[PDB]
Amino acid sequence: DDDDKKTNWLKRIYRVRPCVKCKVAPRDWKVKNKHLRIYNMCKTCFNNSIDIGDDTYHGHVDWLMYADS
Numbered sequence: 055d056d057d058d059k060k061t062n063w064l065k066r067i068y069r070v071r072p073c074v075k076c077k078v079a080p081r082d083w084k085v086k087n088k089h090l091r092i093y094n095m096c097k098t099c100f101n102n103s104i105d106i107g108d109d110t111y112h113g114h115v116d117w118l119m120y121a122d123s
């Protein structure tokens with residue numbers, strides 16, 4: 055099933071690249087219609103970047119959740 059190929063790639067992608075800032079915690083994420091948005095930072099590091107005034111690591115990558123667009 056091609057949808058499983060997509061899903062298993064998304065689980066692997068999420069697992070193997072932790073927060074870009076602390077490099078330990080998993081990334082924050084949300085569902086955005088038929089896309090998974092994986093933010094660059096965990097929530098703790100994101101909130102913190104707002105307090106310190108750093109937008110260097112702000113950003114995300116959207117992923118189609120299905121095999122067929």
Ligand SMILES: Nc1ncnc2c1ncn2[C@@H]1O[C@H](COP(=O)(O)OP(=O)(O)O)[C@@H](O)[C@H]1O
Pocket residue numbers: 082083091093094095096097100111112113114
């Ligand atoms: N956990 C996070 N790590 C890094 N950047 C983030 C995080 N959460 C939000 N951002 C950034 O904050 C902005 C707002 O994102 P979001 O609420 O997804 O956008 P919208 O709903 O305006 O389309 C985007 O620049 C996003 O990349």
Ligand SMILES: [Zn+2]
Pocket residue numbers: 073074075076077078079095096097098099100
């Ligand atoms: Zn972090």
